Amino acid sequence: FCYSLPNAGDVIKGRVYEKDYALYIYLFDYPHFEAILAESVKMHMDRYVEYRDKLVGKTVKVKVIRVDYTKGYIDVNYKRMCRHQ
């Protein structure tokens, strides 16, 4: 293996999108990893709807919680909105 990787705890930027019942994020510096907002997967229905409405299409900062470099997956948690949004 080889390639650039973020470290757990790192706060990085990307654009949020929805897919397969959850919120994911297109990480600007890690475009080839499927990055999911871990907290959105099992979030209770009504709050999930609000969460999706608040974040989809927005540019945000997220904190890295887990990196699977062999399979290409990254789990993150939404932190804050960007200046570009």
Side-chain angles (χ1 to χ4, degrees), residues 1 3-82:
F1 177 73
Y3 214 61
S4 57
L5 301 177
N7 300 294
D10 276 8
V11 181
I12 52 185
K13 301 177 183 183
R15 189 171 182 180
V16 177
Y17 67 96
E18 175 174 47
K19 176 177 183 177
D20 299 312
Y21 311 121
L23 300 184
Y24 289 71
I25 182 170
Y26 287 130
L27 296 176
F28 298 154
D29 290 312
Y30 307 97
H32 302 109
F33 283 79
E34 173 164 286
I36 193 171
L37 271 187
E39 291 192 58
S40 78
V41 182
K42 299 185 182 65
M43 184 177 282
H44 200 69
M45 186 204 87
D46 63 294
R47 281 196 294 110
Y48 175 74
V49 174
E50 292 179 292
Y51 208 55
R52 171 188 164 187
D53 294 324
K54 172 185 181 179
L55 306 176
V56 175
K58 306 295 178 180
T59 294
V60 308
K61 283 178 179 177
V62 298
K63 181 187 177 184
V64 177
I65 61 177
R66 176 180 186 281
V67 178
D68 178 346
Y69 62 83
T70 299
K71 313 298 183 180
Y73 297 97
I74 294 178
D75 298 337
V76 306
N77 285 329
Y78 163 71
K79 181 185 175 61
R80 308 175 187 180
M81 281 283 259
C82 283

